[PDB]
Amino acid sequence: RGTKTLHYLSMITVNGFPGIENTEKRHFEEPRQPLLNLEKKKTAKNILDEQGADAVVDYVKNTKEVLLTDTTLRDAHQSLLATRLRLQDMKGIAQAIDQGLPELFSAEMWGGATFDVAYRFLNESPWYRLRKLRKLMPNTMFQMLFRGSNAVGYQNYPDNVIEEFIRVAAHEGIDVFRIFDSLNWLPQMEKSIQAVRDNGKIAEATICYTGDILDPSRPKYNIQYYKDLAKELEATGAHILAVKDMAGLLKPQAAYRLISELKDTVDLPIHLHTHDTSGNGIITYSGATQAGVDIIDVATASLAGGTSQPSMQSIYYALEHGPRHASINVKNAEQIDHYWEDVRKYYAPFEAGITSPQTEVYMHEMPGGQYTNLKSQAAAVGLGHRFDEIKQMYRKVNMMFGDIIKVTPSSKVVGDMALFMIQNDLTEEDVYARGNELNFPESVVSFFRGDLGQPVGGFPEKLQKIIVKDKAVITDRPGLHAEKVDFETVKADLEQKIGYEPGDHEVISYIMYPQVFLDYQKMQREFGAVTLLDTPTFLHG
Numbered sequence: 247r248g249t250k251t252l253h254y255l256s257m258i259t260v261n262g263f264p265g266i267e268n269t270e271k272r273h274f275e276e277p278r279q280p281l282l283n284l285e286k287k288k289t290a291k292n293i294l295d296e297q298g299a300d301a302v303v304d305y306v307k308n309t310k311e312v313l314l315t316d317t318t319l320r321d322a323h324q325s326l327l328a329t330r331l332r333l334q335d336m337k338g339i340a341q342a343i344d345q346g347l348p349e350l351f352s353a354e355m356w357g358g359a360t361f362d363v364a365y366r367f368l369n370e371s372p373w374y375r376l377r378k379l380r381k382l383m384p385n386t387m388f389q390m391l392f393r394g395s396n397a398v399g400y401q402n403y404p405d406n407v408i409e410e411f412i413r414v415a416a417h418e419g420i421d422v423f424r425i426f427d428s429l430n431w432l433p434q435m436e437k438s439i440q441a442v443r444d445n446g447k448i449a450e451a452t453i454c455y456t457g458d459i460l461d462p463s464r465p466k467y468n469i470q471y472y473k474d475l476a477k478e479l480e481a482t483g484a485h486i487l488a489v490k491d492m493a494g495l496l497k498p499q500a501a502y503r504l505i506s507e508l509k510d511t512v513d514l515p516i517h518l519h520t521h522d523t524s525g526n527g528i529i530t531y532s533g534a535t536q537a538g539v540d541i542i543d544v545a546t547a548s549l550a551g552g553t554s555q556p557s558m559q560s561i562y563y564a565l566e567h568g569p570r571h572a573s574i575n576v577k578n579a580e581q582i583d584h585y586w587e588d589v590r591k592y593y594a595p596f597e598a599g600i601t602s603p604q605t606e607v608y609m610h611e612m613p614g615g616q617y618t619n620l621k622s623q624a625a626a627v628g629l630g631h632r633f634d635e636i637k638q639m640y641r642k643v644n645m646m647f648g649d650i651i652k653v654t655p656s657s658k659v660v661g662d663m664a665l666f667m668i669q670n671d672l673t674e675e676d677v678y679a680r681g682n683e684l685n686f687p688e689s690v691v692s693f694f695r696g697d698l699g700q701p702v703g704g705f706p707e708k709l710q711k712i713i714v715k716d717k718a719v720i721t722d723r724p725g726l727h728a729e730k731v732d733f734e735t736v737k738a739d740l741e742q743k744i745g746y747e748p749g750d751h752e753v754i755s756y757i758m759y760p761q762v763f764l765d766y767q768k769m770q771r772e773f774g775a776v777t778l779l780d781t782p783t784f785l786h787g
């Protein structure tokens with residue numbers, strides 16, 4: 247692999263890394279290796295391996311402390327580093343995390359945007375990352391973010407593709423599947439929940455939080471809605487109930503109220519996921535801890551705060567002498583955090599910039615990722631000045647869309663509309679009047695055609711016809727209409743294309759990212775395993 251490696255090194259030395267400025271290669275010291283005090287603690291991963299998922303949920307229930315999930319490997323750098331954290335950097339500290347923090351309920355290391363980004367921009371396989379980390383991290387439960395009826399892709403897939411993906415992901419190491427739907431619609435969740443149960447893994451059924459349950463002017467997503475959705479989620483056999491707060495909208499008094507009402511509505515342990523965008527993540531988690539939440543999502547201090555999760559280290563001290571403590575070795579966590587502080591410096595080209603708590607997110611409930619994508623695709627098309635009012639436009643088109651849940655990929659729908667109207671000086675009242683000739687963004691017509699599922703309360707019918715002029719509108723699961731996929735023929739059609747017989751993970755990767763996977767194969771032909779280079783060499787030559 248010498249010739250491939252020198253070819254890549256020459257390419258980056260001379261033409262720079264695509265998508266970032268050709269900064270000169272900097273001198274970096276070796277990241278600090280942690281000094282750890284180690285104990286053998288019989289992690290939840292061991293319980294799952296030995297006695298199944300029901301044993302794990304019994305363990306979670308009988309834990310007095312609040313358990314932690316480390317999001318450093320997925321959501322922290324999705325929020326902060328544009329999902330660019332490389333496997334080479336993970337593997338330098340994976341064993342330290344696994345051995346030094348056995349108290350961790352799980353590490354969220356897969357799913358979300360990482361699957362697409364690894365292939366597309368890092369030229370490393372997500373499956374390879376999962377395999378290497380699983381070998382390095384044998385005692386920590388691995389958690390993935392699963393998007394309901396579309397596993398890690400965007401388009402809806404037939405059910406067999408989803409089930410085969412779940413089986414392969416569970417065979418290759420994933421233990422906990424946080425399954426969610428972009429509109430909190432059960433029919434998109436239940437099949438994949440069943441598949442996770444059948445593969446012997448833990449199913450986390452997720453309710454996306456939106457709006458404000460303690461504000462009576464927004465009764466659509468009131469607390470009763472959350473309780474009913476929770477009851478029905480518990481009716482599907484999900485092992486855990488997660489409460490995804492993708493935008494950090496959950497506020498401390500609502501979190502305590504919400505968790506407590508869910509707590510006496512269902513019997514599943516509750517997993518709380520919040521983002522620190524508003525600066526209230528720690529107090530929200532503390533409020534949920536009082537209500538009796540079981541697991542909370544945190545990130546290491548160096549990749550925490552801002553649009554990421556609240557700090558793993560700070561939440562410990564926030565609870566140190568209260569009735570409920572955090573289950574973590576905080577001294578070991580502080581040592582591991584030194585490694586992450588240092589390797590973050592390699593990812594300077596991907597940093598967002600000066601970050602301070604922003605409560606504007608309470609008004610524009612756009613998640614952090616959707617926030618950067620609107621920074622990256624408003625100014626780039628000449629509207630960076632107006633970004634502070636397209637945020638207001640984002641607020642408006644959500645209300646005209648019927649006040650929908652804004653998480654991937656439904657948050658891309660709202661942003662596409664709002665950016666489109668500002669791009670054409672369209673107010674709300676003209677799209678109802680001059681809307682019969684406008685060409686709405688593809689993501690908007692597809693959403694109003696039912697391709698993302700059915701939102702709560704349906705569509706604003708009059709507005710829907712204005713959008714989907716002469717197109718079929720479906721009202722059932724989009725996957726029910728999905729074109730059938732036969733894996734054996736996909737294996738044949740792929741083997742002829744990549745030059746070798748693919749494993750079962752490469753087949754599903756090809757199915758859910760056809761062009762991306764094949765573009766990754768081309769680059770592996772040209773450059774080979776660029777995943778083995780260190781980040782400064784990978785990025786700057």
Ligand SMILES: O=C([O-])CC(=O)C(=O)O
Pocket residue numbers: 321324357358359391393492493613614615652653654657
């Ligand atoms: O916060 C969101 O929009 C959900 C998320 O992490 C993903 O699905 O990649």
Ligand SMILES: [Mn+2]
Pocket residue numbers: 321491492519521
């Ligand atoms: Mn998140």
